[PDB]
Amino acid sequence: APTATLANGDTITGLNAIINEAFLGIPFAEPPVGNLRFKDPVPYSGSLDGQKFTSYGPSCMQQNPEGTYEENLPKAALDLVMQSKVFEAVSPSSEDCLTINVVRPPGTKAGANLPVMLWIFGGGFEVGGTSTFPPAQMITKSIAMGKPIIHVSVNYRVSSWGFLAGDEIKAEGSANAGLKDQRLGMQWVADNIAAFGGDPTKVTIFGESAGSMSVMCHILWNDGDNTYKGKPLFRAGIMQSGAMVPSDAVDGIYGNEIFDLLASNAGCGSASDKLACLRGVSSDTLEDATNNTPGFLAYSSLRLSYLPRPDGVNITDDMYALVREGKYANIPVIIGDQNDEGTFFGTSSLNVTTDAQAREYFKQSFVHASDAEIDTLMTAYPGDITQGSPFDTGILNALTPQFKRISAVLGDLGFTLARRYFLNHYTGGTKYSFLSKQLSGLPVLGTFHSNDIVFQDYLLGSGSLIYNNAFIAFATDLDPNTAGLLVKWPEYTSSSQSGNNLMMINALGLYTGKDNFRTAGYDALFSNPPSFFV
Ligand SMILES: *[C@@H]1O[C@H](CO)[C@@H](O[C@@H]2O[C@H](CO)[C@@H](O)[C@H](O)[C@H]2NC(C)=O)[C@H](O)[C@H]1NC(C)=O
Ligand SMILES: *[C@@H]1O[C@H](CO)[C@@H](O)[C@H](O)[C@H]1NC(C)=O
Numbered sequence: 422a423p424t425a426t427l428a429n430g431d432t433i434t435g436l437n438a439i440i441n442e443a444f445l446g447i448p449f450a451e452p453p454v455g456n457l458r459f460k461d462p463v464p465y466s467g468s469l470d471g472q473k474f475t476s477y478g479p480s481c482m483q484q485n486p487e488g489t490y491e492e493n494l495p496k497a498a499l500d501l502v503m504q505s506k507v508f509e510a511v512s513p514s515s516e517d518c519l520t521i522n523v524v525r526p527p528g529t530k531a532g533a534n535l536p537v538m539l540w541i542f543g544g545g546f547e548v549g550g551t552s553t554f555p556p557a558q559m560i561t562k563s564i565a566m567g568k569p570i571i572h573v574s575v576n577y578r579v580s581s582w583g584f585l586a587g588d589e590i591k592a593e594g595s596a597n598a599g600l601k602d603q604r605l606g607m608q609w610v611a612d613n614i615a616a617f618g619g620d621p622t623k624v625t626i627f628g629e630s631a632g633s634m635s636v637m638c639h640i641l642w643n644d645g646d647n648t649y650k651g652k653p654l655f656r657a658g659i660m661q662s663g664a665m666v667p668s669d670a671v672d673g674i675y676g677n678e679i680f681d682l683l684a685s686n687a688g689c690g691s692a693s694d695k696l697a698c699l700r701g702v703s704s705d706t707l708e709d710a711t712n713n714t715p716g717f718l719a720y721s722s723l724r725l726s727y728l729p730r731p732d733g734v735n736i737t738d739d740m741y742a743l744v745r746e747g748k749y750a751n752i753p754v755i756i757g758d759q760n761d762e763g764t765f766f767g768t769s770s771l772n773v774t775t776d777a778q779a780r781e782y783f784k785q786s787f788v789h790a791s792d793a794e795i796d797t798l799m800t801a802y803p804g805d806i807t808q809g810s811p812f813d814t815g816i817l818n819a820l821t822p823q824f825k826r827i828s829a830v831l832g833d834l835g836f837t838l839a840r841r842y843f844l845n846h847y848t849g850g851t852k853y854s855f856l857s858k859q860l861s862g863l864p865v866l867g868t869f870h871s872n873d874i875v876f877q878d879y880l881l882g883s884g885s886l887i888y889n890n891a892f893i894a895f896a897t898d899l900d901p902n903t904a905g906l907l908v909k910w911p912e913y914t915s916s917s918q919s920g921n922n923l924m925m926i927n928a929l930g931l932y933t934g935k936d937n938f939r940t941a942g943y944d945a946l947f948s949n950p951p952s953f954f955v
């Protein structure tokens with residue numbers, strides 16, 4: 422019943438879900454299989470005329486979060502689950518996975534010109550799919566608000582399939598394939614969304630964790646030039662936990678190590694051209710080899726095996742420098758964090774129990790940091806258990822004497838203080854920032870990483886006022902304050918500014934605060950950002 426005629430003349434059919442109309446699994450690129458592996462996506466040439474798009478397609482190949490070259494129980498367990506026929510059935514994945522989904526309010530028609538919210542999922546650049554992020558909650562609230570929006574989500578290649586690095590990848594011009602996938606989908610939106618009822622000039626991009634850092638990368642892409650056919654691809658951005666990626670160049674030390682490890686695992690250790698060898702192995706073999714390189718939950722933790730890296734061509738340099746140098750798109754942005762971003766990742770190093778062990782874990786993780794920098798970091802983030810994350814929990818949550826400490830560091834460097842650095846240097850447009858403490862009191866994890874996804878797509882809570890309401894108002898009017906919340910959200914200018922600059926959330930609701938916590942950590946970390954790159 423729901424119908425749309427694309428830019429090339431094809432007329433497709435969608436599904437009518439009563440509370441919304443959806444067009445799921447629309448292919449936007451040729452399958453990145455065979456020799457197309459690790460390469461830039463090719464725009465989809467083909468006819469969709471007369472086809473129905475009523476279910477999400479498979480996700481791209483997934484990496485075992487507990488993967489590693491070592492052997493252990495968590496690895497063995499997840500693998501057991503991931504290779505199970507019930508899992509293969511409920512959550513299918515494939516290399517042919519580049520599809521896009523368009524969900525809109527019931528009755529939307531071409532020409533409606535509704536603002537568009539483009540969702541980029543986050544799964545540590547190693548797992549993820551669009552099907553696990555139900556848009557219904559957002560769509561319904563927007564209708565109730567009298568501010569209807571269209572929800573679009575794009576699949577992108579993750580892990581080795583989409584973020585392989587090293588000398589060979591660089592020489593070929595194939596760096597950051599997963600990000601290029603997202604870019605192509607954006608171009609697809611520009612060219613086709615009007616047929617669905619969306620306004621291509623009113624696109625807001627947003628994501629959480631890896632999806633949020635993806636949004637940052639898009640603001641920095643092509644030195645800030647975000648146009649396609651003479652027009653900007655998006656007019657605003659919403660970053661839920663995640664800003665710049667602290668990573669070395671694509672042909673740096675770790676990018677090359679991972680490439681070589683993967684090549685050995687796949688049986689390409691002897692190839693004169695390892696890259697062509699990798700395009701030749703079966704997907705089973707490639708999946709196998711990849712699961713034998715560290716996943717984000719393994720001991721390596723946030724020193725990721727696969728993630729966006731400056732290539733000198735589309736991301737021209739160190740991302741912190743691009744932000745200092747003004748090489749970004751000039752757009753209004755909302756960027757925020759969960760109080761305790763690092764607790765879930767801190768669970769990966771629970772065998773680290775003494776200060777000497779913590780120092781070695783940090784040294785091993787930050788190869789560019791000197792001893793003095795490591796010492797400064799360990800002074801800024803002391804052993805004192807009352808000082809770590811879950812923040813403000815006193816002597817509680819002492820899984821080990823270092824857990825709270827390691828959680829404070831990972832959460833700050835990867836997300837929370839990284840955000841402050843961006844905000845203190847970005848002048849491209851109005852800035853709004855939030856900090857959630859909605860789950861204060863939750864044992865072990867606190868207001869943990871990704872809990873926002875629950876209150877944005879699954880359950881209603883005080884946080885939904887921001888994750889749905891405020892975000893809908895921003896995508897519609899470029900000002901979250903049009904949502905009619907009782908607490909006015911103040912513009913953020915600087916972390917040293919006078920007055921409250923953060924929208925805050927607790928179990929009861931909203932209130933405002935200041936972005937002046939852990940200044941000692943900010944300086945330990947960001948005095949010379951590249952000392953802590955991976
Ligand atoms: C905590 O566990 C990790 C994970 O096994 C240990 O690191 C590994 O140690 C083995 C055995 O020596 C090495 O072959 C691996 O290369 C290490 N893995 C990584 C990812 O580095 C680590 O030594 C343990 N830490 C403590 C403090 O005991
Ligand atoms: C990457 O950069 C090159 C060099 O400017 C440019 O021609 C190319 O169009 C860019 N790719 C994308 C996806 O923007």
Ligand SMILES: [Ca+2]
Binds near residue numbers: 587588680
């Ligand atoms: Ca090499």
Ligand SMILES: [Ca+2]
Binds near residue numbers: 645747749
């Ligand atoms: Ca500029």
